[PDB]
Enzyme design. Structure first.
Site, PDB file in Angstrom:
ATOM      1  N   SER A  12     -23.294  40.440 -68.610  1.00 34.27           N
ATOM      2  CA  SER A  12     -24.386  39.809 -68.881  1.00 34.27           C
ATOM      3  C   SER A  12     -25.183  39.347 -67.689  1.00 34.27           C
ATOM      4  O   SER A  12     -26.650  39.549 -67.825  1.00 34.27           O
ATOM      5  CB  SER A  12     -23.994  38.293 -69.561  1.00 34.27           C
ATOM      6  OG  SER A  12     -22.856  37.813 -69.097  1.00 34.27           O
ATOM      7  N   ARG A  35     -28.338  32.114 -63.502  1.00 33.70           N
ATOM      8  CA  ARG A  35     -27.400  31.269 -64.072  1.00 33.70           C
ATOM      9  C   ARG A  35     -28.074  30.426 -65.287  1.00 33.70           C
ATOM     10  O   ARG A  35     -27.502  30.394 -66.237  1.00 33.70           O
ATOM     11  CB  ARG A  35     -26.627  30.417 -63.358  1.00 33.70           C
ATOM     12  CG  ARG A  35     -25.246  30.255 -63.990  1.00 33.70           C
ATOM     13  CD  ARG A  35     -24.291  29.450 -63.037  1.00 33.70           C
ATOM     14  NE  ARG A  35     -22.750  29.440 -63.605  1.00 33.70           N
ATOM     15  CZ  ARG A  35     -22.213  30.269 -63.380  1.00 33.70           C
ATOM     16  NH1 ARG A  35     -22.253  31.483 -62.748  1.00 33.70           N
ATOM     17  NH2 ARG A  35     -20.787  30.469 -63.877  1.00 33.70           N
ATOM     18  N   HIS A  38     -28.824  32.949 -68.072  1.00 33.97           N
ATOM     19  CA  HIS A  38     -27.657  33.073 -68.722  1.00 33.97           C
ATOM     20  C   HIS A  38     -27.273  31.885 -69.617  1.00 33.97           C
ATOM     21  O   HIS A  38     -26.775  32.166 -70.924  1.00 33.97           O
ATOM     22  CB  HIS A  38     -26.516  32.978 -67.743  1.00 33.97           C
ATOM     23  CG  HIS A  38     -25.112  33.264 -68.335  1.00 33.97           C
ATOM     24  ND1 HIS A  38     -24.563  34.446 -68.773  1.00 33.97           N
ATOM     25  CD2 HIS A  38     -24.159  32.306 -68.710  1.00 33.97           C
ATOM     26  CE1 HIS A  38     -23.303  34.495 -69.170  1.00 33.97           C
ATOM     27  NE2 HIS A  38     -23.002  33.012 -69.232  1.00 33.97           N
TER      28      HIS A  38
END
Lengths: 204, 202
Positions: A12, A35, A38
């Site tokens: 990912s 992040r 994400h």
């Protein structure tokens, strides 16, 4: 489908790097950006990232130094991965203190805002993580103006439709000499906010 | 800036209703749509809502009837407002069971997926809330096909870049006879999912 948790993880982050426009993100914030994206599933969130120069290292350095993380919301606190914390860092959350409700009434604010009074012994050199309550960010401004000790970094990512965008814009416009990172607009929340802390906590 | 909690709360919902195009959202699902928007700050998330007709009523009635809510993720489970629950509903979260890592190696899946074995005694007539792990949703399909008792409703809102979109689209295309609500695409997460449950509870 991929049945390997680590494989899924690794993949990912790759796909994010392949797709996201990270050109305007400095190196000290690249992991944070990836992040946060994400956490939320939106590569375009990077477009809405705003920050002070060196805000990423400010936060990373503080966490290394054992700085505590002060959280406006239970879910922010809960979202911080303890195993990632480099220095036995305290995750602080005061909203549920029994004295908070009376405070709120006396100071003429929200419970979320009133709770910050309890941060005071802890705020110097801290990471402030605000994911839910614009009024906490707004209050913070007051406390800093009044001479409160400065956090090492303020992560201002409150979500929503009342005060959220405004509180974040204000932080960026006048952060009272404190490093900051925000997500502009109505987007944000506990997951994104925790993600930012988690990114700055470990080299990964 | 507004200093009153209740007022902030009330105002947001007013704005959301004003701005959101919820014309194509059925009555039984309106509150859910509004609450999911509120959780994520994106009016256009309504654009990506998908469901089986009557899914909202399915969920509401189950909860009224004391159905448990089965959660793939800690934060989904913690995001549920217990005081809103109408019938002392149990919030089931099995990921932290000590048996799970072994179960994962044994079925050769993720831990989030392995934890689903633990759901079996509780799954019938339940609210399934998947907010994190697409492997959980994928695994759920396997369990259903093998003839597991059917939930009352599957709320499928996992987030991310790997399998999330696919797992949600599969649910819509074949829900194995089970009512569903999803957010299509890469968006989702614990906050949205918990928001969906919370909407239906009260």
């Amino acid at each position: 489908y991929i049945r390997d948790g680590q494989a899924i993880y690794d993949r990912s982050f790759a796909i994010i790097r392949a797709e996201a426009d990270l050109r305007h993100i400095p190196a000290d914030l690249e992991k944070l950006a990836v992040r946060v994206i994400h956490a939320c599933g939106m590569v375009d969130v990077a477009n809405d990232l705003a920050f002070s120069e060196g805000a990423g290292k400010a936060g990373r350095n503080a966490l290394l130094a054992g700085a505590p993380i002060l959280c406006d919301a239970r879910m922010v606190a809960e979202g911080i991965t303890r195993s990632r914390l480099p220095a036995d860092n305290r995750v602080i959350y005061t909203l549920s203190d029994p004295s908070v409700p009376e405070l709120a009434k006396k100071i003429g604010n929200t419970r979320s805002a009133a709770a910050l009074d309890l941060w005071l012994p802890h705020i110097e050199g801290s990471i402030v993580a605000i994911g839910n309550a614009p009024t906490a960010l707004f209050r913070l401004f007051e406390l800093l103006d009044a001479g409160a000790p400065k956090p090492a970094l303020i992560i201002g990512m409150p979500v929503g439709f009342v005060g959220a965008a405004e509180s974040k814009d204000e932080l960026a416009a006048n952060s009272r000499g404190v490093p900051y990172v925000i997500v502009r607009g109505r987007r944000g929340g506990s997951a994104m906010t925790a993600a930012a802390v988690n990114a700055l906590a470990s080299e990964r």
